Amino acid sequence: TTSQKHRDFVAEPMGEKPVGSLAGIGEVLGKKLEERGFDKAYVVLGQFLVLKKDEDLFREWLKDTCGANAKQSRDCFGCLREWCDAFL
DNA sequence: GAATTTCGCGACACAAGGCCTGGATGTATATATCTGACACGTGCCTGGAGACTAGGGAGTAATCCCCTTGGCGGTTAAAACGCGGGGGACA
């Protein structure tokens, strides 16, 4: 149900992880996000938080920023929500 | 010492290179002619454009592992260098 990258991100605090470490964000989407500005994982975390942890809003924002499809956005949102529940 | 004579000198001659000049030739140019091949105009009709749908190809992440890179220590096989010379390039 969960990719290994998902668990690896969830287990420990993000600290200074690159945006490419998020579940559902690979090389291409990572590079697009870095161009768009969100060049650190905690930056995407903050963008998640500002949207009040909402699901649909965050998924639409991710699709509109880097162009990810349903699955990649869903994985990123799920990993971020679990990380918030585990450390926030 | 005088006269006759052989070697050299100057005038005549000849020969060769370089330059001055003109003609024959071909080349580029102005004028004039004209034709047939390029340019434009029209009918139509066949091919390109537009709207819509289904589905498969491709994009993108996740993951494994292999194989490419880098490093080390010896061990020589091969490269560098100099030197004499003779055969090959060049005129």
Side-chain angles (χ1 to χ4, degrees):
Chain A
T1 61
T2 59
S3 57
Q4 190 58 32
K5 194 143 161 295
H6 171 89
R7 305 181 189 91
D8 292 324
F9 183 70
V10 167
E12 57 179 5
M14 53 206 323
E16 292 292 345
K17 277 191 176 61
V19 57
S21 305
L22 300 172
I25 301 303
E27 296 191 348
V28 172
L29 297 175
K31 185 107 292 181
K32 274 186 181 174
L33 288 187
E34 290 182 13
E35 293 184 13
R36 294 279 183 157
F38 308 86
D39 53 341
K40 284 296 179 178
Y42 58 76
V43 184
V44 188
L45 171 76
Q47 181 48 51
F48 168 65
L49 295 173
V50 171
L51 294 191
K52 285 192 55 56
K53 291 190 171 183
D54 191 80
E55 182 172 342
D56 300 343
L57 298 176
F58 175 72
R59 303 189 64 164
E60 189 227 355
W61 167 85
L62 190 56
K63 181 181 179 178
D64 298 1
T65 304
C66 73
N69 53 34
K71 180 175 168 52
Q72 292 130 16
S73 62
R74 182 235 322 281
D75 293 342
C76 182
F77 158 83
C79 110
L80 282 185
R81 182 178 67 182
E82 277 191 19
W83 190 98
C84 287
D85 270 344
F87 297 106
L88 188 71

